[PDB]
Subunit: 380 residues, 4 copies
């Protein structure tokens, strides 16, 4: 019955993640001035360049140079020696108005609850009782390891740390009547960018003692746990230098780390009419409500939409055999407790609030301060 | 016992898919001249612009003006009236190409990344793929065919489809009963009327693609649901490489452990090993060992052979998951270098993978089952 | 004593001129909302692309996509068949704030009259009594031929005309005690973009009869005047297609067509603190005031500046031998009648007004509606 | 009888001059592999960005990453602290290159543009150039020399200079009396103080460059007149090719009929014929025929020989303007193809022309006088 599972996470300096964070900084800037801004901001990062491309219709007046550069500064790129500098990089902007064909078809002249989905697509929600955050342990640990790196970097506990990082966590699992039971951490891989003025031995020791031991519960670590710390050796240069990144290229990392399923839509740079984000958030909220409500131990939720149509086209519940209720009974409960129109989801989850930059690293799910992470008390 | 499941696909002129096709055209162009080229090509598309970005190690000299413009012409974007024109678009090249290692070039006498790849196969179609995503793909292909042959000359290249199937289950296998809902949105000229479009989409597209047994009086049609789709392509929506990874794979079914395919050469194990894991899954189903199967392959830093393989048959096999694993190990060598030899992955066939799905197609080595010995 | 002289002019669709006009559309957009905007907007045009690059510090909120596209539409590029389309071209924007080192050094915390020159440089003014506009006849005729093409194109008199054009006018001159006397037009070259649906014979006839005869005084045209009309044959595609243009690459065309001298500075995209524009305008005003005042028949004026310094570093007057007064006497007259500080020039010539897009084709000099073309009555 | 005249020059790291040097580096790279390459390369520079745009017909395969980055490194922009770094800048390539004509490539057995070009020469310096622009150039060169040898290591690459000379005239010749005003603005580090900079600029730069006879107690110095120039290069001011055409030529003296030089091959007659007209003017002065001279050469559509040549000697010749014209016609063939052979203009020497002036330099064929027969 046993298996290994591995999830990845990347730090704020990974070029794909730079792009997600910039995209969401641009979104939040619009939303601070215009709660109804329509935003579809894609970011591209490569040697010496950030480019913004997409569609925005907004009453806000946003200084894109400042927003981009300040976000790059926040990430921690302020020098050639690091591979990238917010002060001297190229910032190119190709942002236009949202197509009138789209605007007319989705949101123009409609009451808020009746706003059409901004696009077709499918979205999944997932939850699992194996952690208190109702997330897979592999992806929880991978994200927490990258967050701890950035925390220690920014407060000066390990001042040699730089922004680019990647972590991979392999956990050995047992199964229990469709639930999954994590038993031990099999392997932890951590690669992190660093200043020239530190040796590998010191870094590797710090990674084990100040990062891994601070984050991973001791019960899961044992004599046979494999540690690959700076496995490729030195990593002085990182970020976009000799690399290319794009918004929405870490969607598995952003969600459940390979668990459950994904509908393919990216989250970052998109306002709530883009169901790729708002309905995946709501479906997470549904999944977590079902598990915390004690209706199942593990659950996958699918929803889908058509451009310009307010209501979901389909809703599906898969409980992995972990409920006394049938999947049809759970679906009926979901339909009685949730209204998954984007114009209702927006009110329920407060999705005009400019909190999206916070979502763009360390996973969109599993943190308690977001409204989709507060379970709904269900009536049935 | 019944449930719904939904998958989508997009056309060749969807802006994200334009980028996947260009990224793979770039890969193919390199491989044609240098079979050992290393390519990590990202494409970005917005109004008027094709931007290429990324890292290449290669001996090839590629004419990007030609490669990009021919791809765009082939997709069908050849006039400003359509929103994009291969003749007049801006091709920006930001690719960083270097020569291969000098010392090894003169060495005339001749993978480590912790993660997992998933393969999936189901007997519900002959493609060994979910019906939802098979139909979604074929609906886009049909639109391109009818556009290109002049049957529906009001069609433009950008299209999206979505199919919801009502299924029942039988001992872990999934049995399609009927198509519940079809969405089609396709870019169009300024003369055709909405009634005429909706009729053609049902009668000449959907009914030519979906087996009649799956269509009934209750099937729901959302055809041109936005009302007007004249602006399309990159003009309407920015595109990037690797933003249709679920379209490229299994449509929400099975699992995905991360990574996009297009614009990456065969040494990127998250492409090559995903193709191998598909090959294994399809071999098990076509071999009659499983009706449905998820093949999960983990690789470790410092091991070439997989760290571990798990086979999840959903209860559709008489044999245990452990017995199937033993059959897999005796019949497949999933070291990444062996994969690339067995599936002939140095050949420039990647552009063809970049629309209508990487899986389920009638034309790639990973879609040819291996005859298993056991 | 005789010589030939040739000047060129280009139409609004010439790729360099597209860039000047866009640069000045961006300037005027800023100035409409913020009269004190600092603008240094360079434009680049090539196949399917307009890029803006430079420095702007302004209270205005400017929609660069709309400003660029509307200017391209105004020029007349709205279809692939023409080589360029405002609807579907790429517009990239790389506009940042003016460097604080520059701002502090030039204009910050200073009274308006004491504002420092925005840069060092040298500038020339020129005037000549050979036309009523006080301009060389070669450049007057070259500009007027391109203007007449755009006029007839836009009002539908010759609907096959497209925006790209180039004209070259060779005039035979005599000299008269340092003045120049135009005698005859030696050669007129006109190339103009056109729709596919017209033949060369019809175009050539129209160019002679509706353009050249409407614009060039009959006295200068004779039996030996050489006409090269569509000399390279068909010209269906023009503008940025397979070409590249930049702001400030037509500075000779913009000024005196090869006559007098040039200090090297471009005009378009620059607010009045950039002496490259404001002091060249003032020096034109000085030159024209001297000629119309009857102090000389032909005159060249030089001025120069240092970054951050309000006053000119040098002023020089060269009268070609066409005055009874010495060059030193004329200089003394100029210094008594003009204050060539940029902060004074701005008030005299009304240079915060958003009229700059009008300057960007058909020459900055010679038109009566601009304040630098109204002679100052001189006291001496 | 005295007057002032002012000319300027800029350093290698002035952003417009960066672009001229890159455009000509691109030209040279093409010519090194293909002497018949046609090049019209525009460079744009702004914070973090080198953009190449333009049309090329050539058989060469050029590594733009290398050509651009090496040029920037050579100029001295190698760290973010200086505002620009060759290591980390974005190189965007939008050049459109095509192969030469297929039919003529197989033709194995082997200019029309109405306009004028001006040449100018003056005996006031040995360079045969105005003192104003000679001094302005040399002041920038001195700054680069002292920066590069570590004498003044607080110097950065971006610099501008301007020199105003008080002249008298003698029968049309111009005689420099004294330097009236010097401006120097040069980018600098964050540690050096303004007093120290101003002293070094006067004592180690100006006094090492300007002949002492021209400096006096009344010479006006504007050294670092802005007060602070730490931000510089493309970060501070966008650069473009062909925006220093007066710096490249005669500094306001003589005349200019239009056109920039850099990034254009020898078949662009407004480069080649401008060089020839300089050659003619310098030959007349060095031959003792003129002290000062403006050579005006007109070309006509459909004539290879110039349509007309006028020689304006300002009264500095015993011979009439007509007699000088006859000497020019007997000694020079100004057909553009003959020019390119005589001045050896297919050689890749253009990058060297792109800073410190095209005229007056000790190293180009157009600056070597022709011995005249008359
Ligand atoms: N007016 C429209 N109606 C329906 N779909 C559209 C429209 N415009 C663009 N699309 C499609 O939706 C995607 C996301 O906006 C585009 O890439 C395109 O395929
Ligand atoms: N703070 C400054 N002081 C003086 N000159 C400057 C400053 N910043 C830039 N420059 C120079 O002036 C030019 C135009 O702004 C630049 O290319 C640069 O050479
Ligand atoms: K059990
Ligand atoms: K998009
Ligand atoms: K006379
Ligand atoms: K500039
Ligand atoms: Mg999507
Ligand atoms: Mg997309
Ligand atoms: Mg200037
Ligand atoms: Mg400049």
């Amino acid at each position: 019955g046993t298996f290994l599972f591995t999830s990845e996470s990347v730090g704020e300096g990974h070029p794909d993640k730079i792009c997600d964070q910039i995209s969401d900084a641009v979104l939040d800037a619009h939303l601070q001035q215009d709660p109804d801004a329509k935003v579809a901001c894609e970011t591209v990062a490569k040697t010496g360049m950030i480019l913004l491309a997409g569609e925005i219709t907004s009453r806000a007046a946003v200084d894109y140079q400042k927003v981009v550069r300040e976000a790059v500064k926040h990430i921690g790129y302020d020098d050639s020696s690091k591979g990238f500098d917010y002060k001297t990089c190229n910032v190119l902007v190709a942002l236009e108005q949202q197509a009138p064909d789209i605007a007319q078809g989705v949101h123009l002249d409609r009451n808020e609850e009746d706003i059409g989905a901004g696009d077709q697509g499918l979205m999944f929600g997932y939850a699992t009782d194996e952690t208190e955050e109702c997330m897979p342990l592999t992806i929880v640990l991978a994200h927490k390891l990258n967050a701890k790196l950035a925390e220690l970097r920014r407060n000066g506990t390990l001042p040699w740390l730089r922004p680019d990082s990647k972590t991979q966590v392999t956990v050995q699992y047992m199964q229990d009547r469709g639930a999954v039971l994590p038993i031990r951490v099999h392997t932890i891989v951590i690669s992190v960018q660093h200043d020239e003025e530190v040796c590998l031995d010191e870094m590797r020791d710090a990674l084990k003692e100040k990062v891994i031991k601070a984050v991973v519960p001791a019960k899961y670590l044992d004599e046979d746990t494999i540690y690959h710390l700076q496995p490729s050796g030195r990593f002085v240069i990182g970020g976009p230098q000799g690399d290319a990144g794009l918004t929405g290229r870490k969607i598995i990392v952003d969600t459940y780390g390979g668990w459950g399923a994904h509908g393919g839509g990216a989250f970052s740079g998109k306002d709530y009419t883009k169901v790729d984000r708002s309905a995946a958030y709501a479906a997470r909220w549904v999944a977590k409500s079902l598990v915390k409500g004690g209706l199942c131990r593990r659950v996958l939720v699918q929803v889908s939409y058509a451009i310009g149509v307010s209501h979901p086209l389909s809703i599906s519940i898969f409980h992995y055999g972990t409920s006394q209720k049938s999947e049809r009974e759970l679906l009926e409960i979901v339909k009685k407790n949730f209204d998954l129109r984007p114009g209702v989801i927006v009110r329920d989850l407060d999705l005009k609030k400019p909190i999206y930059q916070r979502t763009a690293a360390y996973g969109h799910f599993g943190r308690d301060s977001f409204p989709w992470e507060v379970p709904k008390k269900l009536k049935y």
